[PDB]
Design a protein around this nucleic acid. Structure first.
Ligand SMILES: [Mg+2]
Ligand SMILES: [Mg+2]
Ligand SMILES: [Mg+2]
Ligand SMILES: [Mg+2]
Ligand SMILES: [Mg+2]
Ligand SMILES: [Mg+2]
Ligand SMILES: [Mg+2]
Ligand SMILES: [Mg+2]
Ligand SMILES: [Mg+2]
Ligand SMILES: [Mg+2]
Ligand SMILES: [Mg+2]
Ligand SMILES: [Mg+2]
Ligand SMILES: [Mg+2]
Ligand SMILES: [Mg+2]
Ligand SMILES: [Mg+2]
Ligand SMILES: [Mg+2]
Ligand SMILES: [Mg+2]
Ligand SMILES: [Mg+2]
Ligand SMILES: [Mg+2]
Ligand SMILES: [Mg+2]
Ligand SMILES: [Mg+2]
Ligand SMILES: [Mg+2]
Ligand SMILES: [Mg+2]
Ligand SMILES: [Mg+2]
Ligand SMILES: [Mg+2]
Ligand SMILES: [Mg+2]
Ligand SMILES: [Mg+2]
Ligand SMILES: [Mg+2]
Ligand SMILES: [Mg+2]
Ligand SMILES: [Mg+2]
Ligand SMILES: [Mg+2]
Ligand SMILES: [Mg+2]
Ligand SMILES: [Mg+2]
Ligand SMILES: [Mg+2]
Ligand SMILES: [Mg+2]
Ligand SMILES: [Mg+2]
Ligand SMILES: [Mg+2]
Ligand SMILES: [Mg+2]
Ligand SMILES: [Mg+2]
Ligand SMILES: [Mg+2]
Ligand SMILES: [Mg+2]
Ligand SMILES: [Mg+2]
Ligand SMILES: [Mg+2]
Ligand SMILES: [Mg+2]
Ligand SMILES: [Mg+2]
Ligand SMILES: [Mg+2]
Ligand SMILES: [Mg+2]
Ligand SMILES: [Mg+2]
Ligand SMILES: [Mg+2]
Ligand SMILES: [Mg+2]
Ligand SMILES: [Mg+2]
Ligand SMILES: [Mg+2]
Ligand SMILES: [Mg+2]
Ligand SMILES: [Mg+2]
Ligand SMILES: [Mg+2]
Ligand SMILES: [Mg+2]
Ligand SMILES: [Mg+2]
Ligand SMILES: [Mg+2]
Ligand SMILES: [Mg+2]
Ligand SMILES: [Mg+2]
Ligand SMILES: [Mg+2]
Ligand SMILES: [Mg+2]
Ligand SMILES: [Mg+2]
Ligand SMILES: [Mg+2]
Ligand SMILES: [Mg+2]
Ligand SMILES: [Mg+2]
Ligand SMILES: [Mg+2]
Ligand SMILES: [Mg+2]
Ligand SMILES: [Mg+2]
Ligand SMILES: [Mg+2]
Ligand SMILES: [Mg+2]
Ligand SMILES: [Mg+2]
Ligand SMILES: [Mg+2]
Ligand SMILES: [Mg+2]
Ligand SMILES: [Mg+2]
Ligand SMILES: [Mg+2]
Ligand SMILES: [Mg+2]
Ligand SMILES: [Mg+2]
Ligand SMILES: [Mg+2]
Ligand SMILES: [Mg+2]
Ligand SMILES: [Mg+2]
Ligand SMILES: [Mg+2]
Ligand SMILES: [Mg+2]
Ligand SMILES: [Mg+2]
Ligand SMILES: [Mg+2]
Ligand SMILES: [Mg+2]
Ligand SMILES: [Mg+2]
Ligand SMILES: [Mg+2]
Ligand SMILES: [Mg+2]
Ligand SMILES: [Mg+2]
Ligand SMILES: [Mg+2]
Ligand SMILES: [Mg+2]
Ligand SMILES: [Mg+2]
Ligand SMILES: [Mg+2]
Ligand SMILES: [Mg+2]
Ligand SMILES: [Mg+2]
Ligand SMILES: [Mg+2]
Ligand SMILES: [Mg+2]
Ligand SMILES: [Mg+2]
Ligand SMILES: [Mg+2]
Ligand SMILES: [Mg+2]
Ligand SMILES: [Mg+2]
Ligand SMILES: [Mg+2]
Ligand SMILES: [Mg+2]
Ligand SMILES: [Mg+2]
Ligand SMILES: [Mg+2]
Ligand SMILES: [Mg+2]
Ligand SMILES: [Mg+2]
Ligand SMILES: [Mg+2]
Ligand SMILES: [Mg+2]
Ligand SMILES: [Mg+2]
Ligand SMILES: [Mg+2]
Ligand SMILES: [Mg+2]
Ligand SMILES: [Mg+2]
Ligand SMILES: [Mg+2]
Ligand SMILES: [Mg+2]
Ligand SMILES: [Mg+2]
Ligand SMILES: [Mg+2]
Ligand SMILES: [Mg+2]
Ligand SMILES: [Mg+2]
Ligand SMILES: [Mg+2]
Ligand SMILES: [Mg+2]
Ligand SMILES: [Mg+2]
Ligand SMILES: [Mg+2]
Ligand SMILES: [Mg+2]
Ligand SMILES: [Mg+2]
Ligand SMILES: [Mg+2]
Ligand SMILES: [Mg+2]
Ligand SMILES: [Mg+2]
Ligand SMILES: [Mg+2]
Ligand SMILES: [Mg+2]
Ligand SMILES: [Mg+2]
Ligand SMILES: [Mg+2]
Ligand SMILES: [Mg+2]
Ligand SMILES: [Mg+2]
Ligand SMILES: [Mg+2]
Ligand SMILES: [Mg+2]
Ligand SMILES: [Mg+2]
Ligand SMILES: [Mg+2]
Ligand SMILES: [Mg+2]
Ligand SMILES: [Mg+2]
Ligand SMILES: [Mg+2]
Ligand SMILES: [Mg+2]
Ligand SMILES: [Mg+2]
Ligand SMILES: [Mg+2]
Ligand SMILES: [Mg+2]
Ligand SMILES: [Mg+2]
Ligand SMILES: [Mg+2]
Ligand SMILES: [Mg+2]
Ligand SMILES: [Mg+2]
Ligand SMILES: [Mg+2]
Ligand SMILES: [Mg+2]
Ligand SMILES: [Mg+2]
Ligand SMILES: [Mg+2]
Ligand SMILES: [Mg+2]
Ligand SMILES: [Mg+2]
Ligand SMILES: [Mg+2]
Ligand SMILES: [Mg+2]
Ligand SMILES: [Mg+2]
Ligand SMILES: [Mg+2]
Ligand SMILES: [Mg+2]
Ligand SMILES: [Mg+2]
Ligand SMILES: [Mg+2]
Ligand SMILES: [Mg+2]
Ligand SMILES: [Mg+2]
Ligand SMILES: [Mg+2]
Ligand SMILES: [Mg+2]
Ligand SMILES: [Mg+2]
Ligand SMILES: [Mg+2]
Ligand SMILES: [Mg+2]
Ligand SMILES: [Mg+2]
Ligand SMILES: [Mg+2]
Ligand SMILES: [Mg+2]
Ligand SMILES: [Mg+2]
Ligand SMILES: [Mg+2]
Ligand SMILES: [Mg+2]
Ligand SMILES: [Mg+2]
Ligand SMILES: [Mg+2]
Ligand SMILES: [Mg+2]
Ligand SMILES: [Mg+2]
Ligand SMILES: [Mg+2]
Ligand SMILES: [Mg+2]
Ligand SMILES: [Mg+2]
Ligand SMILES: [Mg+2]
Ligand SMILES: [Mg+2]
Ligand SMILES: [Mg+2]
Ligand SMILES: [Mg+2]
Ligand SMILES: [Mg+2]
Ligand SMILES: [Mg+2]
Ligand SMILES: [Mg+2]
Ligand SMILES: [Mg+2]
Ligand SMILES: [Mg+2]
Ligand SMILES: [Mg+2]
Ligand SMILES: [Mg+2]
Ligand SMILES: [Mg+2]
Ligand SMILES: [Mg+2]
Ligand SMILES: [Mg+2]
Ligand SMILES: [Mg+2]
Ligand SMILES: [Mg+2]
Ligand SMILES: [Mg+2]
Ligand SMILES: [Mg+2]
Ligand SMILES: [Mg+2]
Ligand SMILES: [Mg+2]
Ligand SMILES: [Mg+2]
Ligand SMILES: [Mg+2]
Ligand SMILES: [Mg+2]
Ligand SMILES: [Mg+2]
Ligand SMILES: [Mg+2]
Ligand SMILES: [Mg+2]
Ligand SMILES: [Mg+2]
Ligand SMILES: [Mg+2]
Ligand SMILES: [Mg+2]
Ligand SMILES: [Mg+2]
Ligand SMILES: [Mg+2]
Ligand SMILES: [Mg+2]
Ligand SMILES: [Mg+2]
Ligand SMILES: [Mg+2]
Ligand SMILES: [Mg+2]
Ligand SMILES: [Mg+2]
Ligand SMILES: [Mg+2]
Ligand SMILES: [Mg+2]
Ligand SMILES: [Mg+2]
Ligand SMILES: [Mg+2]
Ligand SMILES: [Mg+2]
Ligand SMILES: [Mg+2]
Ligand SMILES: [Mg+2]
Ligand SMILES: [Mg+2]
Ligand SMILES: [Mg+2]
Ligand SMILES: [Mg+2]
Ligand SMILES: [Mg+2]
Ligand SMILES: [Mg+2]
Ligand SMILES: [Mg+2]
Ligand SMILES: [Mg+2]
Ligand SMILES: [Mg+2]
Ligand SMILES: [Mg+2]
Ligand SMILES: [Mg+2]
Ligand SMILES: [Mg+2]
Ligand SMILES: [Mg+2]
Ligand SMILES: [Mg+2]
Ligand SMILES: [Mg+2]
Ligand SMILES: [Mg+2]
Ligand SMILES: [Mg+2]
Ligand SMILES: [Mg+2]
Ligand SMILES: [Mg+2]
Ligand SMILES: [Mg+2]
Ligand SMILES: [Mg+2]
Ligand SMILES: [Mg+2]
Ligand SMILES: [Mg+2]
Ligand SMILES: [Mg+2]
Ligand SMILES: [Mg+2]
Ligand SMILES: [Mg+2]
Ligand SMILES: [Mg+2]
Ligand SMILES: [Mg+2]
Ligand SMILES: [Mg+2]
Ligand SMILES: [Mg+2]
Ligand SMILES: [Mg+2]
Ligand SMILES: [Mg+2]
Ligand SMILES: [Mg+2]
Ligand SMILES: [Mg+2]
Ligand SMILES: [Mg+2]
Lengths: 275, 48
RNA sequence: AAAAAUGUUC
RNA sequence: CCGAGGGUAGGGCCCGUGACUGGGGCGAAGUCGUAACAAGGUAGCUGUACCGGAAGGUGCGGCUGGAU
RNA sequence: UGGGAGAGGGUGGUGGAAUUCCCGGAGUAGCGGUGAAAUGCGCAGAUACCGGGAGGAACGCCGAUGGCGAAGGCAGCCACCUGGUCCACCCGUGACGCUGAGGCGCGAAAGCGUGGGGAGCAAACCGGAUUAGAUACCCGGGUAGUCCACGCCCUAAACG
RNA sequence: CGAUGUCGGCUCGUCGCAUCCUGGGGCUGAAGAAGGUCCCAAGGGUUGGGCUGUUCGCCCAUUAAAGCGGCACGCGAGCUG
RNA sequence: GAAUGCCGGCAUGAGUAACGAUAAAGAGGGUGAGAAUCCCUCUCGCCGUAAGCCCAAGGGUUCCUACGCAAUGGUCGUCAGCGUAGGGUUAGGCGGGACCUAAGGUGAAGCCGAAAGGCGUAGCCGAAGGGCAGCCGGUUAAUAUUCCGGCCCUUCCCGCAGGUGCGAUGGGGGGACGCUCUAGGCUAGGGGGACCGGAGCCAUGGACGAGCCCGGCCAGAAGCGCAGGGUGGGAGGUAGGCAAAUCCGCCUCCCAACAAGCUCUGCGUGGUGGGGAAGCCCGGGUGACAACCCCCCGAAGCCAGGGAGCCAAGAAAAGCCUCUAAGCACAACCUGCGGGAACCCGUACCGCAAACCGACACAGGUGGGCGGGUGCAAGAGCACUCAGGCGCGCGGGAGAACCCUCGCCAAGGAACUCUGCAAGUUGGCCCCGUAACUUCGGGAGAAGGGGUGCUCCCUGGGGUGAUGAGCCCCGGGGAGCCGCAGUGAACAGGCUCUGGCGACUGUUUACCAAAAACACAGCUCUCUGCGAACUCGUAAGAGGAGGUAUAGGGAGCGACGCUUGCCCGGUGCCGGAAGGUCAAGGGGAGGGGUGCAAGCCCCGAACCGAAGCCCCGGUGAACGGCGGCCGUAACUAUAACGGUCCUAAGGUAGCGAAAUUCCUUGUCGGGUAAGUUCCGACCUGCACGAAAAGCGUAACGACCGGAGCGCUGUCUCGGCGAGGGACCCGGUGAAAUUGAACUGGCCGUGAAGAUGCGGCCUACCCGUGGCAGGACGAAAAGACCCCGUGGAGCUUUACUGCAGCC
RNA sequence: GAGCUAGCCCUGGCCAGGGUGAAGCUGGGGUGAGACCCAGUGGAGGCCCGAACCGGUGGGGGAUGCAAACCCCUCGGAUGA
């Protein structure tokens, strides 16, 4: 339920903020926060290798559990639901009856104080983590591993979710958020339910400064540079692309596919993405 | 206005100092060449 | 289950 | 002190007029097509939407004020 | 008070038929289409037939000249929440009634916003015909939209 | 071409005369007035404004008249730009 | 003898410009060979959120003294940041190290690279971050939280006593965190006092006064008081914190719950130690047995790790506490007391600057803290002023032009000009008042207007305190006084209407462009299934991202509103197990060389054989493209209409002489006296047009236009005045430039613009202040143009390679 | 060679004073319940004015400079990209 502002500045008429209604706790768990080494988009050589990065708000990285098979059968309580600056989703704080405390990303519907568990025998219930094979066909899942015991890699962004469309051997057929149809291993864990905070995509950043708070530095069009800089550089006055629209490095950027043709996971993609 | 020389002893020693020179093949040659010339100062003098 | 328009004036 | 009024400034209503522009009305026998009236030759009409020299056409739904 | 009838309304769920796309088999020179054709599709293996799958939308028979709602309108099936309504007994209240400028709410379709969704259908648009022309009818495509959520719009041959 | 700074304006003038005005004439299809035209004449004078960078030009209001040219299309070791 | 030659020396310009902020000087006395310039005193002026003070960096003896004045000092010099000599920097507590980590760097393990080297987990290093013990005063010519005095504290070592399962680099807690706003109580700092202390003063008309002037504190251990921060207690279970755990984490139960208790800071008090002015006398002494008190104002600082709200969600690690592990429980640890022990480095001086960065004693640049008083609504603003520091290291005169900076101006009032450039105007606060339009915020400080000082009188509420006095803070009403003028000085919007462009705040060519350019939220296309795409790297390894399609890359467009048409023939891209072409390779008909030969060797056809291209389709918010000619209407005119040729399709909505219109100052209309501009229209649009977006759009703009009001020295049209220069004198004394010069006008001539030739004319010798027409004046071996088989940046369907990719 | 300059990383510091007055909260009104209306409180913002500070708009001076980019007047941002 994105929060609109009255137009009391130029930028406030479009600026919407998250409603933060599901958050129950406004300070991370100490035993779970490490410093997030900000990069500015620069590699170990020092070079900018992803452009227009930096200067965003300081952050603390919250350790998330993408391996909920680590604590099979040990139930846990949903202690809180918390903010996380490092992802689009909300993170849930779990008190395992072990006395172990872990963070997980918060699926939609998950209510503070409910019990969740992980394992083959888990109820098909919001926030439980079963191997893909033990989840019934037609179930909406998120935080899906892509290879057994390697960590939840799919459907972790706000509102995302994969769907189990059918089975075939040691593999189940998943419809990823992208609309791709993939074979993911049945022993791969997923968490039933979609990720919470669907409204995340309806947030209107509002002004340039907001983007800078996200660590996003200004983006310079190729069309505005000189021929030393960019295939779209130069021209007298404004100028159209004048060639197949291209990246700063020469390659075409309109339709040109770039997935490795001989990639071994091709055997596991049923149907390239939709739309 | 602000000019180019903004002296800083720590900077001077970490950039042009004897130890910085010896750490890289170029710096070693630098010292080598200044010794062969007979410089009185292989590295800049800075007080620490 | 219709091929095919139009028509000077009191 | 108030005070005719005069002055400076800013408003509201009304009227006349204005390059040009929009349709409207009318104008015995102009130009294009033939939409409607017979099932008017694709039944019509309708609110709406898009489109087309133009009447109109088409979609969606509605009405019979439709033939057999 | 005790009963009844009903596509009344909202939410969630769920069932089968059909169209489409995909996958497998099998299979050959046409298919499709019309007034007749052409466009289109098809030996790069279409159509037709079988199995599997994905998806969305609409509910055949019952079905009616029937039912319900104030109207717009409402049709598979299940449950939940809920409105109106008729009937019997003649129990209670004791005119508390009727209408209603404003106000408020509802309000088919189409349209609009933000999302989702998208099979079939289909304004716009394309192409094939027809034709003097054919910015139409008829044909092969096809985008909005049609569907869902929320919010607008507030129109009508909103008619008995 | 081991540099002669380019239009326009401003400022300062100075010269020419194919004279715009002013002085003097002849001819007139010169009645007068006022014109026309040619001749002599460079002494002095030759306005303020709107438009446009403009020169020029058009226009407004005047004027005796609102001359045309040369001076490195006079004049940036004077200014503007 | 020439090379804008090289080096040096010395000329010229020239006693010329200049002598570095216009804050400012004058006199007396001293010193001395010599004095505007040094010392002293008096007077005067300037800074005072500094031009004062204290830190940090940088500098490196510049510090203090004694003796000096050749050079340095833009003059002088007896002075000095200068020459010589001597002296000066004193710490367990300040700063840094013997503590901790941040980025980063480095790096046992490990990985990679022709070599050199590149990486890399831990670890180590790495500070202005964390952590940690000293405050006040005195002293030196020069150092002082450093020496001294007072009063305190830290750790290390040993011992004594008491208490305890002690013990760690291991577990855990804590350390530990943002931004804005902010409570209470304090302190720093300040104001006043009719109270306390003080040497005095009574002037020039008055005042012996509740007069004036001056000062009225500082540090402090325990205890105590005030204010705050931190913190539940117990029990039972336990599978988690990579061993263990009595700790922490999880569940239960009893009690406690604004508390209290325990603890830690702040502040006050506090034994005690200090300080202590004006004035006078020569840094000192007196004052002085100085007093040291009350009220108010009051932090941004302190209690603090306080509170609230927000979204962008806000280091680490040690110290410290706790838990247990080896071990050890004669130990060890904890607490208390005692004695001993406590190292290396810095410490001078400048430090918004004459000592640092700018070649200079350079009007520039340089982080942190303090920064007093009064008045002005507030403040670090502005004026003045304290403390303190300065008058800027050439002076003296004169009183021209001209220039700078400044003041004023009759009448006019933009007539100036490319343009109101510039300069006026406006100007704070309080009150009244405020339009189109609008996205309902705005526009808005719209516009416009009134008010503003001082005196007296009455009264309202606030803080403090006590509920009162006093002080202090917001006001309200009535009556008056004066001036040209009351925000009387200083600081402080001119305004309106209307287009263009860009939504907006932002960004930019450091040093000629701040814009309409870039950016921007937002929109679309596109790539990307995660060992992602993409980027950097030979690689390793990184970035992407400790992210996962609501995400990440690329590209265009650029808030928002309304929209974004038709062309897929070409080019791109995407799809297409057929067909065609196609390399290596396979294949090996068939030839060939050779040899007595077995054989060895070469050639080699069909045929199989990738991507790519061909080919078939799709695709425009991919590259892009969106016609011609002729005719036709009951007037002319013009064509809704037709004919035909071509196209892949022929430019739709909207807009249009435009940031686009050649002709052009188009035509018409508005505004003006007059309008190549401007605004509104028209539309035969040379050559708009729909995300290189089309058309609009409130708000915003040091953008660019047009108009009006206000006001002006912009101007008609200049005048006067000020100061700093220019001028004279004393001091010091450059520069570019310079073939040599004894360097005139005209008309000619001359390589075509002559001081230099001819002819004529003019002209005594030499300067000074001035002006710039000439010396084709200076400066820069023309930056335009061409030339060179010179160079470089950039492009591509130029050529040819290479990376990368298939 | 990043002691200038450009970006980023880490860790610190700075931003006088005044103006406007968003959400929310409270109370009242409102209704079947609502939306909502109002008042008070609240203190939001690449909000407003304006020092420090960061700038560098227009003009003037400067031009062998005080300065190889300075000075004066003016002007932009000043809780934020
Ligand atoms: Mg909003
Ligand atoms: Mg609103
Ligand atoms: Mg939330
Ligand atoms: Mg931690
Ligand atoms: Mg990272
Ligand atoms: Mg590195
Ligand atoms: Mg390196
Ligand atoms: Mg990159
Ligand atoms: Mg970057
Ligand atoms: Mg989050
Ligand atoms: Mg994310
Ligand atoms: Mg798998
Ligand atoms: Mg978005
Ligand atoms: Mg961020
Ligand atoms: Mg951009
Ligand atoms: Mg460019
Ligand atoms: Mg460019
Ligand atoms: Mg480059
Ligand atoms: Mg290149
Ligand atoms: Mg290029
Ligand atoms: Mg280009
Ligand atoms: Mg260019
Ligand atoms: Mg360009
Ligand atoms: Mg162009
Ligand atoms: Mg360009
Ligand atoms: Mg290209
Ligand atoms: Mg895919
Ligand atoms: Mg600089
Ligand atoms: Mg230098
Ligand atoms: Mg610096
Ligand atoms: Mg340093
Ligand atoms: Mg350094
Ligand atoms: Mg540095
Ligand atoms: Mg070094
Ligand atoms: Mg280095
Ligand atoms: Mg080497
Ligand atoms: Mg070596
Ligand atoms: Mg040397
Ligand atoms: Mg030596
Ligand atoms: Mg060296
Ligand atoms: Mg028919
Ligand atoms: Mg006809
Ligand atoms: Mg007839
Ligand atoms: Mg009156
Ligand atoms: Mg009168
Ligand atoms: Mg008809
Ligand atoms: Mg019909
Ligand atoms: Mg049609
Ligand atoms: Mg075929
Ligand atoms: Mg075949
Ligand atoms: Mg589908
Ligand atoms: Mg009925
Ligand atoms: Mg009864
Ligand atoms: Mg409706
Ligand atoms: Mg509808
Ligand atoms: Mg009916
Ligand atoms: Mg030349
Ligand atoms: Mg020369
Ligand atoms: Mg020259
Ligand atoms: Mg010259
Ligand atoms: Mg010359
Ligand atoms: Mg020229
Ligand atoms: Mg003039
Ligand atoms: Mg005459
Ligand atoms: Mg006559
Ligand atoms: Mg004359
Ligand atoms: Mg002309
Ligand atoms: Mg002209
Ligand atoms: Mg006359
Ligand atoms: Mg002339
Ligand atoms: Mg001539
Ligand atoms: Mg000239
Ligand atoms: Mg000429
Ligand atoms: Mg000419
Ligand atoms: Mg000339
Ligand atoms: Mg000239
Ligand atoms: Mg000039
Ligand atoms: Mg000129
Ligand atoms: Mg000259
Ligand atoms: Mg001259
Ligand atoms: Mg010679
Ligand atoms: Mg020379
Ligand atoms: Mg030479
Ligand atoms: Mg030489
Ligand atoms: Mg010599
Ligand atoms: Mg010499
Ligand atoms: Mg001389
Ligand atoms: Mg001389
Ligand atoms: Mg002289
Ligand atoms: Mg001279
Ligand atoms: Mg000079
Ligand atoms: Mg000088
Ligand atoms: Mg000077
Ligand atoms: Mg000054
Ligand atoms: Mg002054
Ligand atoms: Mg004197
Ligand atoms: Mg002297
Ligand atoms: Mg002397
Ligand atoms: Mg003195
Ligand atoms: Mg005196
Ligand atoms: Mg002061
Ligand atoms: Mg030095
Ligand atoms: Mg000397
Ligand atoms: Mg001497
Ligand atoms: Mg000597
Ligand atoms: Mg000297
Ligand atoms: Mg001297
Ligand atoms: Mg000097
Ligand atoms: Mg001397
Ligand atoms: Mg002497
Ligand atoms: Mg000393
Ligand atoms: Mg000590
Ligand atoms: Mg030691
Ligand atoms: Mg360390
Ligand atoms: Mg090495
Ligand atoms: Mg280091
Ligand atoms: Mg430290
Ligand atoms: Mg310390
Ligand atoms: Mg102390
Ligand atoms: Mg103990
Ligand atoms: Mg213990
Ligand atoms: Mg913490
Ligand atoms: Mg933290
Ligand atoms: Mg910290
Ligand atoms: Mg104190
Ligand atoms: Mg005070
Ligand atoms: Mg005390
Ligand atoms: Mg407890
Ligand atoms: Mg346990
Ligand atoms: Mg403390
Ligand atoms: Mg502060
Ligand atoms: Mg604090
Ligand atoms: Mg707090
Ligand atoms: Mg915030
Ligand atoms: Mg760390
Ligand atoms: Mg023992
Ligand atoms: Mg030691
Ligand atoms: Mg010291
Ligand atoms: Mg300064
Ligand atoms: Mg400072
Ligand atoms: Mg100094
Ligand atoms: Mg100083
Ligand atoms: Mg020096
Ligand atoms: Mg310099
Ligand atoms: Mg000086
Ligand atoms: Mg200086
Ligand atoms: Mg004071
Ligand atoms: Mg004030
Ligand atoms: Mg002076
Ligand atoms: Mg000064
Ligand atoms: Mg001076
Ligand atoms: Mg004189
Ligand atoms: Mg004289
Ligand atoms: Mg001055
Ligand atoms: Mg006067
Ligand atoms: Mg005047
Ligand atoms: Mg006037
Ligand atoms: Mg006027
Ligand atoms: Mg004017
Ligand atoms: Mg201009
Ligand atoms: Mg103008
Ligand atoms: Mg209004
Ligand atoms: Mg208006
Ligand atoms: Mg407007
Ligand atoms: Mg409004
Ligand atoms: Mg106001
Ligand atoms: Mg006003
Ligand atoms: Mg007075
Ligand atoms: Mg003012
Ligand atoms: Mg102002
Ligand atoms: Mg215009
Ligand atoms: Mg711009
Ligand atoms: Mg802008
Ligand atoms: Mg816009
Ligand atoms: Mg923008
Ligand atoms: Mg920048
Ligand atoms: Mg520039
Ligand atoms: Mg430049
Ligand atoms: Mg430059
Ligand atoms: Mg430069
Ligand atoms: Mg400039
Ligand atoms: Mg600007
Ligand atoms: Mg730019
Ligand atoms: Mg958009
Ligand atoms: Mg690369
Ligand atoms: Mg990686
Ligand atoms: Mg990472
Ligand atoms: Mg842009
Ligand atoms: Mg095409
Ligand atoms: Mg194509
Ligand atoms: Mg095609
Ligand atoms: Mg192939
Ligand atoms: Mg294009
Ligand atoms: Mg093209
Ligand atoms: Mg083309
Ligand atoms: Mg259209
Ligand atoms: Mg036009
Ligand atoms: Mg025009
Ligand atoms: Mg236009
Ligand atoms: Mg054009
Ligand atoms: Mg034109
Ligand atoms: Mg023209
Ligand atoms: Mg005209
Ligand atoms: Mg116009
Ligand atoms: Mg025309
Ligand atoms: Mg384009
Ligand atoms: Mg264009
Ligand atoms: Mg609008
Ligand atoms: Mg606008
Ligand atoms: Mg702007
Ligand atoms: Mg701006
Ligand atoms: Mg601007
Ligand atoms: Mg003047
Ligand atoms: Mg004077
Ligand atoms: Mg004399
Ligand atoms: Mg002299
Ligand atoms: Mg001298
Ligand atoms: Mg001679
Ligand atoms: Mg002469
Ligand atoms: Mg001569
Ligand atoms: Mg000649
Ligand atoms: Mg001559
Ligand atoms: Mg001769
Ligand atoms: Mg001669
Ligand atoms: Mg002569
Ligand atoms: Mg002289
Ligand atoms: Mg002179
Ligand atoms: Mg001259
Ligand atoms: Mg010459
Ligand atoms: Mg000349
Ligand atoms: Mg000359
Ligand atoms: Mg000249
Ligand atoms: Mg030059
Ligand atoms: Mg040369
Ligand atoms: Mg040359
Ligand atoms: Mg040159
Ligand atoms: Mg040229
Ligand atoms: Mg040439
Ligand atoms: Mg050649
Ligand atoms: Mg060449
Ligand atoms: Mg080259
Ligand atoms: Mg290569
Ligand atoms: Mg590629
Ligand atoms: Mg730097
Ligand atoms: Mg530096
Ligand atoms: Mg630096
Ligand atoms: Mg600030
Ligand atoms: Mg106010
Ligand atoms: Mg308020
Ligand atoms: Mg609140
Ligand atoms: Mg602001
Ligand atoms: Mg304001
Ligand atoms: Mg300037
Ligand atoms: Mg100059
Ligand atoms: Mg210069
Ligand atoms: Mg300045
Ligand atoms: Mg100023
Ligand atoms: Mg700003
Ligand atoms: Mg401001
Ligand atoms: Mg401020």
């Amino acid at each position: 339920a994105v929060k609109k502002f009255k137009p009391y500045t130029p930028s406030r008429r479009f600026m919407t903020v998250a409603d933060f209604s599901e958050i129950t706790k406004t300070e991370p768990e100490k035993s779970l926060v490490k410093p997030l080494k900000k990069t500015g988009g620069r590699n170990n050589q020092g070079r900018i290798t992803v452009r227009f990065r930096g200067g965003g708000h300081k952050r603390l990285y919250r350790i998330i559990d993408f391996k909920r098979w680590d604590k099979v059968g040990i139930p846990a309580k949903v202690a809180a639901i918390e903010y996380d600056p490092n992802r689009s989703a909300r993170i849930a704080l779990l008190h395992y009856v072990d006395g172990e405390k872990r963070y997980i990303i918060a699926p939609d519907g998950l209510q503070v104080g409910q019990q969740v568990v992980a394992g083959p025998d888990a109820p098909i219930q919001v926030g439980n983590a079963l191997p893909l094979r033990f989840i019934p066909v037609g179930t909406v899942v998120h935080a899906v591993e892509l290879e057994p015991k390697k960590g939840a890699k799919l459907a972790r962004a706000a509102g995302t979710s994969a769907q189990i469309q059918g089975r075939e051997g040691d593999y189940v057929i998943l419809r990823l958020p992208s609309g791709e149809l993939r074979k993911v291993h049945g022993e791969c864990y997923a968490t039933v339910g979609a990720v919470g905070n669907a409204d995340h995509k309806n947030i209107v950043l509002g002004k340039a400064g907001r983007s800078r708070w996200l660590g996003r530095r200004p983006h310079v069009r190729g069309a505005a540079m000189n021929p030393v800089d960019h295939p779209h550089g130069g021209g007298e006055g404004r100028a159209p692309r004048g060639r197949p629209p291209a990246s700063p490095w020469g390659w075409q950027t309109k339709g040109l596919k770039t997935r490795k043709r001989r990639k071994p996971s091709s055997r596991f993609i049923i149907a390239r993405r939709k739309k | 206005m602000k000019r180019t020389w903004q002296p800083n002893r720590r900077k001077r020693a970490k950039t042009h100092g004897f130890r910085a020179r010896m750490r890289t093949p170029g710096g070693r040659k630098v010292l080598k060449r200044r010794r062969q010339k007979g410089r009185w100062r292989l590295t800049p003098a800075v007080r620490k």
